């Protein structure tokens, strides 16, 4: 009386992680939005000299 | 040639973005060739304009 | 009398999602086609000044 649908849900749990979409998307921006403030600052500081 | 269940859709999508982005570059090219049309027009119009003053 | 071909179709169902091609392709464009209307608007507004 193999529980076909208990082995499956035990293969899954051992070959799957957990991921929050809106947390991997907030870090990415966080790091690319720090290099874009130094690119702007540079440009702005040349037109003021 | 056996493949996993999601690979064929990653390969179709990586050529949708490319055609969309290569589509934008075209739109912008055509715009910049319209600036050189406005510019030429302007110049030749200022010349034809001065003529009409001086000969008067 | 293991139903070889019932366990398989139970491993699949637990390690597979569902995806509509023409819905992941309509959103993408939808977001990239809003930034391209602000790039054009900018250019157009400089040649009119």
Curated annotation (Swiss-Prot), chains A, C:
Q: Where does this one sit in the cell?
A: Virion; Host membrane
Which portions of this protein are annotated as coiled-coil regions?
A: none
Domain remark in the UniProt entry: Consists of 3 domains (N1/D1, N2/D2, and CT) separated by glycine-rich repeats and a C-terminal transmembrane segment. The N2 domain interacts with the F pilus, whereas the N1 domain forms a complex with the C-terminal domain of TolA at later stages of the infection process. The C-terminal domain is required for release of viral particles from the host bacterial membrane and proper integration of G3P and G6P proteins in the virion.
Q: What does this protein do?
A: Plays essential roles both in the penetration of the viral genome into the bacterial host via pilus retraction and in the extrusion process. During the initial step of infection, G3P mediates adsorption of the phage to its primary receptor, the tip of host F-pilus. Attachment of the phage causes pilus retraction bringing the viral particle into close proximity of the host cell inner membrane.
| Subunit organization | Interacts with G6P; this interaction is required for proper integration of G3P and G6P into the virion. Interacts with G8P. Interacts with the tip of the host pilus. Interacts (via N-terminus) with host TolA. Interacts (via transmembrane domain) with host TolQ (via 2nd and 3rd transmembrane domains); this interaction allows the phage translocation across the host inner membrane. Interacts (via transmembrane domain) with host TolR (via transmembrane domain); this interaction allows the phage translocation across the host inner membrane.
Q: To which protein family does this belong?
A: Belongs to the inovirus G3P protein family.
Name this protein carries in UniProt: Attachment protein G3P
Species per Swiss-Prot/TrEMBL record:
Enterobacteria phage f1 (Bacteriophage f1)
**Designated gene of the protein:** III
Section of the entire sequence shown: 275 to 323 of 424
Curated annotation (Swiss-Prot), chain B:
The membrane topology term of the UniProt record is:
Multi-pass membrane protein
**In its keyword annotation, does this UniProt entry include Transmembrane?**
yes
Keywords recorded for this protein, A-Z: Host membrane, Membrane, Transmembrane, Transmembrane helix, Viral penetration into host cytoplasm, Viral penetration into host cytoplasm via pilus retraction, Virion, Virus entry into host cell
Subcellular location(s) of the protein: Virion; Host membrane
Q: Name one GO biological process term.
A: symbiont entry into host cell
What parts of the sequence cross the membrane? 3-23, 36-56
**Taxonomy, superkingdom:** Viruses
In which broad location class does this protein mainly occur, judging by the first location in its UniProt entry? virion
Q: Which GO terms describe its cellular component?
A: host cell membrane; membrane; virion component
What is this protein's function? Answer: Plays essential roles both in the entry of the viral genome into the bacterial host and in budding process. The formation of the G3P-G6P complex termed adsorption complex is essential for correct termination of filamentous phage assembly.
Q: Which family does it belong to?
A: Belongs to the inovirus G6P protein family.
Query: Partners and quaternary state?
Result: Interacts with G3P; this interaction is required for proper integration of G3P and G6P into the virion.
In Swiss-Prot or TrEMBL terms, this protein is called Head virion protein G6P
Q: Summarize which stretch of the complete protein this chain spans.
A: 1 to 56 of 112
């Amino acid at each position: 009386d193999f529980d076909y649908e208990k082995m499956a849900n035990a293969n899954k749990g051992a070959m799957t992680e957990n991921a929050d979409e809106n947390a991997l998307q907030s870090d990415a921006k966080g790091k690319l939005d720090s290099v874009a403030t130094d690119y702007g600052a540079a440009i702005d500081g040349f037109i003021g000299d | 040639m056996p493949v996993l269940l999601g690979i064929p859709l990653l390969l179709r999508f990586l050529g949708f973005l490319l055609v969309t982005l290569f589509g934008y570059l075209l739109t912008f090219l055509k715009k910049g060739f319209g600036k050189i049309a406005i510019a030429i027009s302007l110049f030749l119009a200022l010349i034809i304009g001065l003529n009409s003053i001086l000969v008067g």
